[PDB]
Motif scaffolding. Structure first.
Motif, PDB file in Angstrom:
ATOM      1  N   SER A 167      21.896  39.455  47.218  1.00 39.85           N
ATOM      2  CA  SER A 167      21.956  38.260  46.384  1.00 39.85           C
ATOM      3  C   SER A 167      22.755  37.124  47.015  1.00 39.85           C
ATOM      4  O   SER A 167      22.911  36.065  46.403  1.00 39.85           O
ATOM      5  N   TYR A 168      23.274  37.333  48.222  1.00 36.57           N
ATOM      6  CA  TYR A 168      24.077  36.313  48.862  1.00 36.57           C
ATOM      7  C   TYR A 168      23.942  36.255  50.343  1.00 36.57           C
ATOM      8  O   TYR A 168      23.736  37.263  51.022  1.00 36.57           O
ATOM      9  N   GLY A 169      24.149  35.064  50.884  1.00 38.57           N
ATOM     10  CA  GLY A 169      24.033  34.969  52.302  1.00 38.57           C
ATOM     11  C   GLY A 169      25.304  35.117  53.036  1.00 38.57           C
ATOM     12  O   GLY A 169      26.404  34.996  52.497  1.00 38.57           O
ATOM     13  N   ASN A 227      27.372  33.831  56.418  1.00 36.73           N
ATOM     14  CA  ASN A 227      27.525  32.845  57.490  1.00 36.73           C
ATOM     15  C   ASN A 227      28.550  33.350  58.511  1.00 36.73           C
ATOM     16  O   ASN A 227      29.439  34.150  58.184  1.00 36.73           O
ATOM     17  N   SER A 248      28.095  33.037  50.995  1.00 37.21           N
ATOM     18  CA  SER A 248      27.730  31.724  50.497  1.00 37.21           C
ATOM     19  C   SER A 248      27.285  31.818  49.050  1.00 37.21           C
ATOM     20  O   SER A 248      26.645  32.785  48.658  1.00 37.21           O
ATOM     21  N   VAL A 249      27.658  30.818  48.267  1.00 41.37           N
ATOM     22  CA  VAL A 249      27.295  30.727  46.879  1.00 41.37           C
ATOM     23  C   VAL A 249      26.649  29.390  46.705  1.00 41.37           C
ATOM     24  O   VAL A 249      26.853  28.441  47.490  1.00 41.37           O
ATOM     25  N   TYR A 250      25.804  29.342  45.690  1.00 38.79           N
ATOM     26  CA  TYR A 250      25.084  28.143  45.323  1.00 38.79           C
ATOM     27  C   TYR A 250      25.886  27.581  44.175  1.00 38.79           C
ATOM     28  O   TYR A 250      26.418  28.294  43.331  1.00 38.79           O
ATOM     29  N   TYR A 251      26.006  26.277  44.238  1.00 38.48           N
ATOM     30  CA  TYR A 251      26.623  25.496  43.198  1.00 38.48           C
ATOM     31  C   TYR A 251      26.012  24.124  43.347  1.00 38.48           C
ATOM     32  O   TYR A 251      25.943  23.583  44.464  1.00 38.48           O
ATOM     33  N   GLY A 252      25.570  23.594  42.212  1.00 36.12           N
ATOM     34  CA  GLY A 252      24.957  22.293  42.142  1.00 36.12           C
ATOM     35  C   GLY A 252      24.446  21.735  43.443  1.00 36.12           C
ATOM     36  O   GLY A 252      25.148  20.976  44.115  1.00 36.12           O
ATOM     37  N   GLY A 253      23.236  22.119  43.830  1.00 33.70           N
ATOM     38  CA  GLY A 253      22.693  21.600  45.068  1.00 33.70           C
ATOM     39  C   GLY A 253      22.952  22.418  46.317  1.00 33.70           C
ATOM     40  O   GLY A 253      22.071  23.141  46.764  1.00 33.70           O
ATOM     41  N   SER A 254      24.150  22.323  46.885  1.00 27.97           N
ATOM     42  CA  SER A 254      24.438  23.057  48.119  1.00 27.97           C
ATOM     43  C   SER A 254      25.526  24.128  48.076  1.00 27.97           C
ATOM     44  O   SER A 254      26.406  24.131  47.210  1.00 27.97           O
ATOM     45  N   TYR A 255      25.448  25.002  49.077  1.00 28.25           N
ATOM     46  CA  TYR A 255      26.328  26.148  49.271  1.00 28.25           C
ATOM     47  C   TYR A 255      27.732  25.907  49.831  1.00 28.25           C
ATOM     48  O   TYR A 255      28.058  24.836  50.348  1.00 28.25           O
ATOM     49  N   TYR A 256      28.555  26.939  49.717  1.00 27.35           N
ATOM     50  CA  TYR A 256      29.923  26.929  50.220  1.00 27.35           C
ATOM     51  C   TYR A 256      30.330  28.393  50.433  1.00 27.35           C
ATOM     52  O   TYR A 256      29.610  29.297  50.014  1.00 27.35           O
ATOM     53  N   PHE A 257      31.462  28.641  51.087  1.00 25.35           N
ATOM     54  CA  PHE A 257      31.877  30.022  51.346  1.00 25.35           C
ATOM     55  C   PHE A 257      33.047  30.422  50.468  1.00 25.35           C
ATOM     56  O   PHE A 257      34.142  29.896  50.614  1.00 25.35           O
ATOM     57  N   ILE A 281      20.058  20.414  39.007  1.00 20.19           N
ATOM     58  CA  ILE A 281      20.464  21.617  39.762  1.00 20.19           C
ATOM     59  C   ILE A 281      20.623  22.964  39.040  1.00 20.19           C
ATOM     60  O   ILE A 281      20.191  23.127  37.888  1.00 20.19           O
ATOM     61  N   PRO A 314      23.622  32.017  47.033  1.00 19.08           N
ATOM     62  CA  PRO A 314      24.057  32.201  48.372  1.00 19.08           C
ATOM     63  C   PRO A 314      23.152  31.421  49.367  1.00 19.08           C
ATOM     64  O   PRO A 314      21.965  30.998  49.174  1.00 19.08           O
ATOM     65  N   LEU A 315      23.783  31.338  50.521  1.00 19.17           N
ATOM     66  CA  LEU A 315      23.225  30.791  51.758  1.00 19.17           C
ATOM     67  C   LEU A 315      23.533  32.079  52.543  1.00 19.17           C
ATOM     68  O   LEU A 315      23.262  33.174  52.218  1.00 19.17           O
TER      69      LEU A 315
END
Lengths: 219, 214, 9
Positions: free
Chosen positions: A31-33, A35, A99-108, C2, C8-9
């Motif tokens: 469920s997560y990427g 990096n 990485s998590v998704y939050y409003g639009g783009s990801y972060y670590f 959104i 995730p990425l």
């Protein structure tokens, strides 16, 4: 609790390759990427690339593509990063992060302790401990100890087996000729030396060495 | 790609201060900005994400804001455990990029370095090698330039330097500089100098010896 | 328009 345990420190010859790990727990791996970030003493963190465990989709940073390959084991929740045709520039500490998704783009949100990679042809070798006495030529005197030519880190230095704690500065090692070199200083009153004994004790676990060097007057 | 710049590699502050770390993108990031905190032990932690502002489980004294190209982290009241390196990172474009990072340190009063130079050790010379060592201890601030002169001039080859991190009891810094040569080159010359220039004074602090006075 | 999280990425 989300956790990411990365592989142990690595030691490799240039021209060779290496495959480090990142085992995830406490959450759904697919469920997560994941990096990968690179960090060389020379400040900054470089984004290497990203991988999606579910599909195995990989997206690379142009400068790290060609040499790097990200893969995963959707059965042990482990992500792997292989580095090929290594060179001195691939020496650093590499991290893996979720990485998590939050409003639009990801972060670590979670990172691993980091994996240290030292690209070198050196083999375990004990350091040579050189005593540093003032040159044959008042109230407080500094003495040193030069620990040169060892591999690999770390090295443990103390003075008089610990009985001399204050006024001590053991400096970070530095990569000399494919080998490490460091130093240490201790400042004692002029009443303690050479009136008494001052010894630096350097231990180097990898070579199973425990050296006690005495600092005596003259060159 | 998008370059992230953090003007100020090292920043000074006192516990209890309102610290503000900046970071500027090469182009509009549309609020896709994150802040990470790395401790000396090497571990990294997320504090804020999305154009700053959003928390994670980190103390409320950490606050973030910014827009378009400029953003910033603010630690309204700085604590001991807050002493670390902070990096920003844009998640708007690929490849993701980080700023160089800003490392905080504790404000201390200026202290000139104590300097010591040391000729090569008999032990080492017999191995045909020769390293002259020079410590510059307990100084503040951390910026300092060391110069080595052989027989009165230049010399930069062989010189490898090392710096400690700020101390925990006092807030001073220490540095070690080592010049390495062969027994032969070393024995072809006389005077060896270590000059330390610190804002602590205009004139450098000089330490040296002459092989002949040995 | 959104999402926001558990992703995730």
């Amino acid at each position: 609790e989300v956790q990411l345990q990365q592989s142990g420190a690595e030691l490799v010859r240039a021209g060779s390759s290496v495959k480090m790990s990142c085992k995830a727990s406490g959450y759904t791996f697919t469920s997560y990427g994941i990096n990968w970030v690179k960090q060389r003493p020379g400040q900054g963190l470089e984004w290497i690339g990203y991988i999606n465990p579910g599909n195995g989709y990989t997206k690379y940073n142009e400068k790290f593509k060609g040499k790097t390959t990200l893969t995963v084991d959707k059965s042990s929740s482990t992500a792997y990063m292989q580095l090929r045709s290594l060179t001195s520039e691939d020496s650093a500490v590499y991290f893996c992060a979720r990485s998590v998704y939050y409003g639009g783009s990801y972060y670590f949100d979670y990172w691993g302790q980091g994996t240290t990679l030292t690209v070198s042809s050196a083999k375990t070798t004990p350091p040579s401990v050189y005593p540093l006495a003032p040159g044959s030529a008042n109230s407080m005197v500094t003495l040193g100890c030069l620990v040169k030519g060892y591999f690999p880190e770390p090295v443990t230095v103390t003075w008089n087996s610990g009985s001399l704690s204050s006024g001590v500065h053991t400096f970070p090692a530095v990569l000399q000729s494919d080998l490490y070199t460091l130093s240490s200083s201790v400042t004692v009153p002029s009443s303690p030396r050479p009136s008494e004994t001052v010894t630096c004790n350097v231990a180097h676990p990898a070579s199973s060495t425990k050296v006690d060097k005495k600092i005596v007057p003259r060159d | 790609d998008i370059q992230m710049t953090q003007t100020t590699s090292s920043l000074s502050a006192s516990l209890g201060d309102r610290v503000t770390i900046s970071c500027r993108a090469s182009q509009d990031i549309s609020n896709y900005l994150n802040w990470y905190q790395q401790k000396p032990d090497g571990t990294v932690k997320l504090l804020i994400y999305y154009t700053s502002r959003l928390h994670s489980g980190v103390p409320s004294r950490f606050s973030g804001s910014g827009s378009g190209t400029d953003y910033s982290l603010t630690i309204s009241n700085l604590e001991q455990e807050d002493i670390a390196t902070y990096f920003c990172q844009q998640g708007n474009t690929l490849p993701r990029t980080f700023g160089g990072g800003t490392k905080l340190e504790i404000k201390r009063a200026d202290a000139a370095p104590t300097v010591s130079i040391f000729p090569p050790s008999s032990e080492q010379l017999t191995s045909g090698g020769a390293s002259v060592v020079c410590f510059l201890n307990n100084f503040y601030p951390k910026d300092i330039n060391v110069k080595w002169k052989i027989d009165g001039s230049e010399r930069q080859n062989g010189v490898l330097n090392s710096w400690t991190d700020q101390d925990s009891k006092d807030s001073t810094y220490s540095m070690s500089s080592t010049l390495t040569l062969t027994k032969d080159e070393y024995e072809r010359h006389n005077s060896y100098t270590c000059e330390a220039t610190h804002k602590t004074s205009t004139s450098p602090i000089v330490k040296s010896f002459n092989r002949n006075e040995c | 328009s959104i999402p926001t999280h558990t992703s995730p990425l």
